[PDB]
Every structure is written in C-alpha cells, then in structure tokens.
Design an enzyme around this catalytic site. Sequence first.
Site, PDB file in Angstrom:
ATOM      1  N   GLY A  31       1.020  -0.732   0.053  1.00 51.57           N
ATOM      2  CA  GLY A  31      -0.483   0.492   0.547  1.00 51.57           C
ATOM      3  C   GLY A  31       0.706   1.138   0.148  1.00 51.57           C
ATOM      4  CB  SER A  89       3.451   0.381  -4.239  1.00 49.37           C
ATOM      5  OG  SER A  89       2.128   0.234  -4.607  1.00 49.37           O
ATOM      6  N   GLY A  90       4.168   2.994  -4.736  1.00 47.75           N
ATOM      7  CA  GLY A  90       4.457   4.376  -5.383  1.00 47.75           C
ATOM      8  C   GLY A  90       4.829   6.102  -4.482  1.00 47.75           C
TER       9      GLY A  90
HETATM   10  O1  ORU Z   1       2.233  -1.203  -1.857  1.00 52.00           O
HETATM   11  N1  ORU Z   1       3.547  -2.133  -2.416  1.00 52.00           N
HETATM   12  C1  ORU Z   1       4.843  -2.079  -1.493  1.00 52.00           C
HETATM   13  C2  ORU Z   1       5.470  -3.285  -1.448  1.00 52.00           C
HETATM   14  C3  ORU Z   1       6.576  -3.340  -1.175  1.00 52.00           C
HETATM   15  C4  ORU Z   1       7.233  -4.105  -0.411  1.00 52.00           C
HETATM   16  N2  ORU Z   1       6.526  -4.898  -0.229  1.00 52.00           N
HETATM   17  C5  ORU Z   1       6.834  -6.603  -0.488  1.00 52.00           C
HETATM   18  N3  ORU Z   1       5.967  -7.619   0.009  1.00 52.00           N
HETATM   19  N4  ORU Z   1       5.308  -6.406   0.898  1.00 52.00           N
HETATM   20  N5  ORU Z   1       5.658  -5.670   0.468  1.00 52.00           N
HETATM   21  C6  ORU Z   1       8.439  -4.304   0.123  1.00 52.00           C
HETATM   22  C7  ORU Z   1       9.396  -2.784   0.357  1.00 52.00           C
HETATM   23  C8  ORU Z   1       9.248  -2.065  -1.318  1.00 52.00           C
HETATM   24 CL1  ORU Z   1       9.813  -0.939  -1.319  1.00 52.00          CL
HETATM   25  C9  ORU Z   1       7.498  -2.013  -1.587  1.00 52.00           C
HETATM   26  F1  ORU Z   1       7.170  -0.932  -2.745  1.00 52.00           F
HETATM   27  C10 ORU Z   1       4.972  -3.916  -3.135  1.00 52.00           C
HETATM   28  C11 ORU Z   1       3.919  -3.925  -3.564  1.00 52.00           C
HETATM   29  C12 ORU Z   1       2.835  -2.932  -2.855  1.00 52.00           C
HETATM   30  C13 ORU Z   1       1.286  -2.804  -4.001  1.00 52.00           C
HETATM   31  C14 ORU Z   1       1.637  -2.663  -5.461  1.00 52.00           C
HETATM   32  C15 ORU Z   1       0.037  -3.296  -5.740  1.00 52.00           C
HETATM   33  C16 ORU Z   1       0.063  -1.537  -5.840  1.00 52.00           C
HETATM   34  C17 ORU Z   1      -0.039  -3.020  -7.504  1.00 52.00           C
HETATM   35  N6  ORU Z   1       0.789  -3.509  -3.168  1.00 52.00           N
HETATM   36  C18 ORU Z   1      -0.560  -2.633  -2.751  1.00 52.00           C
HETATM   37  C19 ORU Z   1      -0.921  -3.697  -2.004  1.00 52.00           C
HETATM   38  C20 ORU Z   1      -2.848  -3.851  -1.693  1.00 52.00           C
HETATM   39  C21 ORU Z   1      -3.218  -2.081  -1.495  1.00 52.00           C
HETATM   40  N7  ORU Z   1      -4.573  -2.249  -0.242  1.00 52.00           N
HETATM   41  C22 ORU Z   1      -4.351  -3.783   0.249  1.00 52.00           C
HETATM   42  S1  ORU Z   1      -2.679  -5.124   0.256  1.00 52.00           S
HETATM   43  C23 ORU Z   1      -0.313  -4.732  -2.143  1.00 52.00           C
HETATM   44  N8  ORU Z   1       0.811  -4.734  -3.068  1.00 52.00           N
END
Ligand code: ORU
Length: 236
Positions: free
Chosen positions: A186, A188-189
């Site tokens: 959540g 990311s971005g």
């Molecule tokens: O946000 N986000 C963060 C990480 C991440 C991690 N992670 C590794 N494993 N989990 N996080 C570790 C380090 C760093 Cl720098 C990271 F950027 C990876 C992926 C995501 C996003 C990709 C989705 C948007 C396409 N995502 C959002 C949700 C949810 C949203 N609402 C409920 S779930 C699930 N995935």
Amino acid sequence: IVGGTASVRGEWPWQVTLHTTSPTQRHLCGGSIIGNQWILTAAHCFYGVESPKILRVYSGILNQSEIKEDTSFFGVQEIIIHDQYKMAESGYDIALLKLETTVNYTDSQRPISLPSKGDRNVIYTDCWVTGWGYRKLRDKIQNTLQKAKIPLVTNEECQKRYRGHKITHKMICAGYREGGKDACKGDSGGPLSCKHNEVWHLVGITSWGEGCAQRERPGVYTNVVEYVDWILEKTQ
Ligand SMILES: [O-][n+]1cc(-c2c(-n3cnnn3)ccc(Cl)c2F)ccc1[C@@H](CC1CC1)n1cc(-c2cncs2)cn1
C-alpha cells in the site's frame, strides 16, 4: 510503513493518495505532487486499471477517513507509463498522472522538487518513506499517514541481498541491516523524500522488496534522478 510513526497535518504536503473506484473505492497507491497538474507514481500501480476514468487523486489528506462522498478530488486526464515497464522488479517502475486541472498549491498541497542538476554525487543522509500501507505483511491500510526515516544502501550491497534480481543504476535501495523499518503493501508509488541543504527532493519512488522490513532485505525504489530527462520530456 513498518516501524513508522504517525504524521501530522501539513507534514508531507506533496504526498497524495491515489484511489481506484472499480469495483469499489479504495486506496490504490501513493504518489507525489511534482507540478500543478502532475503526479509522479509507480507504473505497477496500474496493473488491472482499465482506464483513467476510475481514478481519483486526493491531496491534502492526513487520514483516509477524511475522504467522504463530498471530498474534492482531481480527475486524471492521462496515465503515462514508461515505455519499457514490464514488472516492478525489472525496473522502469515509473508513471506520470496528468490531472484534469491545476493544483492551486496551499499549506497542505505542495510540490516536491526533482533531484537537481549538478547534484548527481550528493550523498543523501536524511531520507524518509511515507504512506498509508501495511504495518506488517498481513495487515490493513492505515488511517493516518505514516513516516519512517530509512538509510540509503549502496547498489553493490543491494545486489548482494538480491542475487536473483538485476539491481541497476536506475534503482536505489534503502533499509537497515537488522530490518524493522521499511515500506510495505500500500506504500508503493509514494515518495522516498530526502532533505539536502534544507530542501526536499524526490529521490525515489517506492517500488518493491522481498517481504517487509526483513533483515538484510532492503526496499527497492525507482531512482528518480535517472528519469529526470524522461519526466521533463513528458511534462513539456
Ligand atoms: O505497496 N506495495 C509495496 C511493495 C513493497 C514491499 N512489499 C513486499 N511485499 N509487500 N510489500 C516491500 C518494499 C517496498 Cl519498497 C515495496 F514497495 C510491493 C507492492 C506493493 C503494492 C503493489 C500493488 C499496487 C500494485 N501493493 C499494494 C497492495 C495492497 C493495497 N491495498 C491492500 S493490499 C499490495 N501490494
């Protein structure tokens, strides 16, 4: 954000929450204001997004619970994903959102500068990751925007932690060797924001990582300085 703490209003005024509205409204990703009509975010956010019609950009938000049926938002005119993007772990995880109208900047909604020309060799020692993401791998989106200070890691060390991936100069890694503070689901971005000479710079875009805040597994971020020419070309 794992191991982070609550922000206060106005503390990260370039941070936005990008919502999707299909099949229901929810926080999709973070993003950063970089111009009056421009948001910088991650390309991976738009996996399964059918068109910009279903997106809403909310700025000046501290708590997700502030967003109600009458809360103002910006429509998205265009999603511009890097032409070489395929998946976050392979790089090019960068996207621009062109808004339908211009942000009037206020105390709660402000732009962050891109890394400056002539700053390529700056060592950033004051870097922060922010977002509404999980506090641990099996969690939920947080109401209050969270913040954590995280140290940058050399690309050589980062590659040693991710021997199954190609860590390129277009990525930057950040994390503690013992873990405990990191982005998570959540976040990311959103921005990796670093302060230098008392000015904030958008150094990274939160992209991917193996688990959340694990020992010797840093978070991986799009290295914004290496996309400045691409950003300027798309926003001209
Ligand atoms: O946000 N986000 C963060 C990480 C991440 C991690 N992670 C590794 N494993 N989990 N996080 C570790 C380090 C760093 Cl720098 C990271 F950027 C990876 C992926 C995501 C996003 C990709 C989705 C948007 C396409 N995502 C959002 C949700 C949810 C949203 N609402 C409920 S779930 C699930 N995935």
